[PDB]
Amino acid sequence: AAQGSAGSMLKPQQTTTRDLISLDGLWKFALASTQPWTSQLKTSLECPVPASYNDIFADSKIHDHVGWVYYQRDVIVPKGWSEERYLVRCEAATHHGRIYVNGNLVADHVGGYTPFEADITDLVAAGEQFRLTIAVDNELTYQTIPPGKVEILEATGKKVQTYQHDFYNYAGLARSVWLYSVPQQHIQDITVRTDVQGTTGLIDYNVVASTTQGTIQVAVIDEDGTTVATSSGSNGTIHIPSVHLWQPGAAYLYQLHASIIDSSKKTIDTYKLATGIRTVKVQGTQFLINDKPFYFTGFGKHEDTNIRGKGHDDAYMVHDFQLLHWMGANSFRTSHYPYAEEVMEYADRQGIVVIDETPAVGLAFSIPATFSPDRINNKTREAHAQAIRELIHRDKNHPSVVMWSIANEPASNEDGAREYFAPLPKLARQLDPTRPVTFANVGLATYKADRIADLFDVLCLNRYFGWYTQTAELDEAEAALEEELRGWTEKYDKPIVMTEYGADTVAGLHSVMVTPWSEEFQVEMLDMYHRVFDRFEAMAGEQVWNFADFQTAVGVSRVDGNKKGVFTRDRKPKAAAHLLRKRWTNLH
Amino acid sequence: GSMLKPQQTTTRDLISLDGLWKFALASDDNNTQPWTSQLKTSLECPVPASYNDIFADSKIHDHVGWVYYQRDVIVPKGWSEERYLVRCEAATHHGRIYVNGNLVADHVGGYTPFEADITDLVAAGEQFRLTIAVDNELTYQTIPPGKVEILEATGKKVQTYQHDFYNYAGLARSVWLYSVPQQHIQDITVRTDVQGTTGLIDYNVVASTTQGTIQVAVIDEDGTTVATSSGSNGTIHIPSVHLWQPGAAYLYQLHASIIDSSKKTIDTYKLATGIRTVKVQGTQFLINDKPFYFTGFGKHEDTNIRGKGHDDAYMVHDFQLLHWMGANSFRTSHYPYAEEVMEYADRQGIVVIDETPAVGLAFSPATFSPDRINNKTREAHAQAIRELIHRDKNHPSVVMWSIANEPASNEDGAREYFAPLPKLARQLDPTRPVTFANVGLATYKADRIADLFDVLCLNRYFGWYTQTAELDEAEAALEEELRGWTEKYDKPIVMTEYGADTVAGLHSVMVTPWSEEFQVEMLDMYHRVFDRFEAMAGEQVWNFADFQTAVGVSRVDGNKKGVFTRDRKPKAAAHLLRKRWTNL
């Protein structure tokens, strides 16, 4: 883990040449008390892996814990492995993960939403058994990339985790853990850039191999199963005659088979990696996927379900996606962190557009000046960029991912904000020149007051007039909102997307009168917002906040988390769901 | 400018005017004087109610300013030779009575009576058009204070105010036409003392003219008269009296009649009294010379459609729910409630803290100045004390006056403002201790009003605001404050309010606010701490039931701190309370 760079490999898969093993299951679990990774574990406490631990146990001490926790289990390297290089991966640690093989530290990793792994091949032998213990610290600071500070309670002395975001600070191994193998000479990375000449579809590729052994073949197969182009070399471009384009309601995916042939006509490594072929351009006030203009519809979302909290779930993913299709949503935004990788591949097959967001949420203090040597400084920017790299490295390939979101609701109206943010969108366009760049702008940072927006390609606005400013005054709110829309459309020649608009709603709370927290009120606000968007020709999309009720930090104005959900936390449609379905399916 | 609650006797008659009145709100027509014509509305608004929620119409509910209630009234033929008048039990804040286009009263209290002798305005046996104008506007000088403002873009009028509950306007309490004899009784006063086993009472009647003589009978609950007296006032002993006790209501009836030259009764009034004494000595609240502990709630006049409007059934049920859960008391939160509730409490043996309508004397800008709350405001504040005490002085159930809720008792000006007020109270009624409900910020250090009051009423919400979801931490900050007060003042302390919001049906096994469980845990841990402080005089949970409030992003369709739901269903805390309050 180095400054200015990203060292993950490709998403482990199984092949004729590589082997894959799941470490998911229950693991022994305990709380920081000393040096637990040097002996076995002493607990009847077992925690499921793909999951956040906080809610799992029905224990207050555990849920409330500030610091490190310890997952542990034994592992056996299959005896079939020697002559194969093998290693241990975490798709994500809560925030700060550490990997111990038997009681030597083998990896330390600061991102909370991106993979990390350790090559253990010289460290254990094929056929041998070791003690995998993984340490996850949930502590946020001013330098950690969702920012925060631990404090202490004057009377009881209890440790307490402050932060500036909405959603609860769920910790642990939220994403699958793996033990896999790769041949000594292997493909480590692949870069795919899809473009279109007339009707001919060309993808520039780039394959990275552990050594300089043999050569690099690439077959490119269609959905039916018949290869449609081939190539040699670590890099080039591939021509596809009469391409089936990946379309935002009509996913087409070709399968790029990268192989590492040895001296002779023999395959020694291979890797299957799906791409779809699509361009993304912003021209002025317009968002083009495949040179036709596009309008987002959908939600910012969360990784949040009932007991597992943030832990990725196969069936909620599929269900969630069906609800999107049910209502004719075409996109969503990975809200305030990168989601599980498997959600991105699913999004690709599913033909859903994604706004991929770094875990930079709450870069402000006004939910004290936020950009200084105290709160958000240069060491913080360093971590912010560190996170931009790992996200892009990981996600660069998904045709569904369509624009990077640098941050949520940063204090972009304050002195200091511009210096801070300047290198970040520039980093993004550099590492990946194919997609546009944005961040979701807060209400305070008005068109006048914001000093960041010009550095970005698309304008993403979060607004809540009918909620905060004009509380229940929908007409006075329609005033405020078009005031603001005008301001942006006049000052800038970018396209605009409402990334956040909504109102807390308690399922079953009804009222014939104007009343916030009533299914009815939610409808009305949503509806008048829509009416306003349609009168602005500069709008390029709309994302309700949020998909579904979700858990947040304890708070008096938070009714057991955030209820701005259009669906309940158990995924049941409020009235708003049906409004959105009616608008999204019945017009363009 | 009031008089005893109208009642039917052998010499007084009494008509209810409740029912559907033609209702219309003031627009800016040519018709600037609507009270001198038929109303253009085809809306009928029920009277005992209050209008906002009634019509399912926003413009009505949202309205800032005047509305008009109107109906025809027939003064009975037999009323002549008799003196009759039109009373309003209450309005919204500002009420004006018009009798055939004629302005006949204008009254600025929001929750007390006003009336008009109309004997010379309408002929007995004749019909007249009665129209009542009620204005809902608060100002820096109305007793709940607040300002009206204009929404910049749309232009819509809006009413700001400082207090929790919604600003329901209208004729929230009954309207009457009633008869009284030319030479009638106007006011009575009763003061009950206990002298060993014997109960004594000092009656003071004020009739219209001074001819004939005043006579008084005192009848027990069984029909048998038990002491007699003569004279516009004197003092009565009652051998082995039956005491009105907080567990066991007992109400003697006092018949005060106005005898004439002969042996005939020209006028007469039935007035229930219970015999009972209230003394605060040291940290102790003694009812009939034994230590007492308030259990119960702050309540609200708030039900579903009628809003603030008095309701017989919800009244009876509410009390039945106090009995169900072993409550013994309550506080007329942030306004005197309807007269009949106080009467009912008497019959019910329920103890009452009578509060004025003075909330939201607090702007957290400097709140006590020639801008926000000045002398003029303080005039109106003293007026409400006058009218509250004048109306309610007699009730054995009323046991303390509460001058105001949650004023900024910690800011400059606070002291000069309040000084005269409790003095006023004790002057108007020596028989009861005086208080106000202390806000959180006004700590035992910061507060500069408290020494001037008999009992200390506080309403701490740490586990809610301060140590939000940190009950162990809140426990400490709580006992810290209680040491402070009990260390600093030699008076009884009553948690006037306390508790957390809760959504019925919302559940959790861990520490999560807005779950039924969290409420039980907060309420509980407070009781643990109350039981450790010997200075404590009572606990009143903050709230009997959920009630509507001013619209807010932090208020889920009102306040949900209620121990029951708005339709009066038990939350988890109701049962916790019932368990504690019945059993020890």
From TrEMBL, chain B:
Protein name from the UniProt record: Beta-glucuronidase
Domain Glycoside hydrolase family 2 catalytic stretches: 278-584
Keyword annotations from UniProtKB, A to Z: Glycosidase, Hydrolase
Residue ranges of coiled coil: none
Residues reported to bind alpha-D-glucuronate: 164, 461, 465, 555, 559, 561
Source organism (scientific name): Aspergillus oryzae
Gene3D superfamilies in UniProt: Galactose-binding domain-like, Glycosidases, Immunoglobulins
GO biological process: carbohydrate metabolic process; glucuronoside catabolic process
Domain Glycoside hydrolase family 2 immunoglobulin-like beta-sandwich: 184-276
Family annotation (SUPFAM superfamilies): (Trans)glycosidases, beta-Galactosidase/glucuronidase domain, Galactose-binding domain-like
